[PDB]
Amino acid sequence: HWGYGKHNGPEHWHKDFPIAKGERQSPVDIDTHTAKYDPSLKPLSVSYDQATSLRILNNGHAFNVEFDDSQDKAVLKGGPLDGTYRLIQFHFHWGSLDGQGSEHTVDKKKYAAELHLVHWNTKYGDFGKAVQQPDGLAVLGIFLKVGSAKPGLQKVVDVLDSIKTKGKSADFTNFDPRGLLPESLDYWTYPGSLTTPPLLECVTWIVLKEPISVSSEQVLKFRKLNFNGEGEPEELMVDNWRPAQPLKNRQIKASFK
Ligand SMILES: NS(=O)(=O)c1c(F)c(F)c(Sc2nc3ccccc3s2)c(F)c1F
Ligand SMILES: [Zn+2]
DSSP: OOOSSTTTSGGGGGGTOGGGGSSSOSOOEEOTTTSEEOTTSOOEEEEOTTOOEEEEEEOSSSEEEEEOOSSSOSEEEETTOSSOEEEEEEEEEEOSSTTOOOSSEETTBOOSEEEEEEEEEGGGSSHHHHTTSTTOEEEEEEEEEESSOOGGGHHHHHHGGGGOSTTOEEEOOSOOGGGGOOSOOOEEEEEEOOSSTTOOSOEEEEEESSOEEEOHHHHHHHTTOBSSOTTSOOOBOOOOOOOOOOOTTOOOEESOO
16 A cells, blocks of 8 residues: 555555654765765675676566575675675666655755665575664665766666566566666765665665766656556656655764765
8 A cells, every 4th residue: 555646655654664753764865064984984895797687577666677696696795884785686766857756865955866776684694584684784875867878777778668567577687787887986874774665774775976877768768657557547657755754863974085
């Protein structure tokens, strides 16, 4: 029953998932002036050379590109992180218009979209167990603005017509997610949560400073997706983002400046 519309949208989530009003909820606004530079934070390590994508899926809330996480292939490590975390999927959140769509904001700025590359802590042996742990997940967030095309995103955009409606999937092999990374790896980092139900407070958030650009035609194709299933009255998949939640005590750290 949860979703993004008037009657089931984020402001309604706490009824089914009371952790919605918890102490480390995401996303947040990144106040770039109150974030603490920390010279002791390590460079992020993104080792994606051996990634193996398998499938793309419309789950009724976004689309996921899934990876085979059964060995140490695509991993995140270093940065603020203690273990190594394995890539399991990526997805995006986007707007009905270019002026909105991102979940994190930067001094109140909303970007057109936000890419989430979701990884899990190897010491918990799988994603299902990792989410019940406070340091179970690491999500690398990357902001999208509209301007020039991202060539590396086009294979994703071209297959979306085949997964139009809730439930649909398609084989999605040899997709290289290094094609979605900006040039710099400068980041902010803070402790928080899944930004969809079940809203578990299990995530180390790593948000890149440098957005990637995508074309208006790329983002327009995200907006032709559907929340509904093939049976049903079309609701376009747009504005599937949660807004910024209270920071409460937490401190946001910066890798830079
Ligand atoms: N916005 S987010 O990166 O915090 C996020 C995520 F990490 C995810 F891993 C997912 S999919 C997901 N599936 C399950 C299954 C069981 C328990 C928690 C989750 S989150 C998700 F939908 C999502 F929005
Ligand atoms: Zn997400």
